[PDB]
Amino acid sequence: VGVCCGYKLCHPC
């Protein structure tokens, strides 16, 4: 999943 910081949930979402 990697870093999912580009929506709202900046984590691996």
From Swiss-Prot:
It is found in: Secreted. The modification 4-hydroxyproline is found at P12. Transmembrane segments: none annotated. Disulfide bonds join C4-C13, C5-C10. Keywords: Disulfide bond, Hydroxylation, Neurotoxin, Secreted, Toxin. GO terms for cellular component: extracellular region. The keyword Secreted applies. Expressed by the venom duct. GO terms for molecular function: toxin activity. It comes from the Eukaryota. The cysteine framework is X (CC-CX[hydroxyPro]C). Exists in two forms, due to cis-trans isomerization at 11-His-Hyp-12. Belongs to the conotoxin T superfamily. Chi-conotoxins inhibit the neuronal noradrenaline transporter (NET/SLC6A2). This is Chi-conotoxin MrIB.
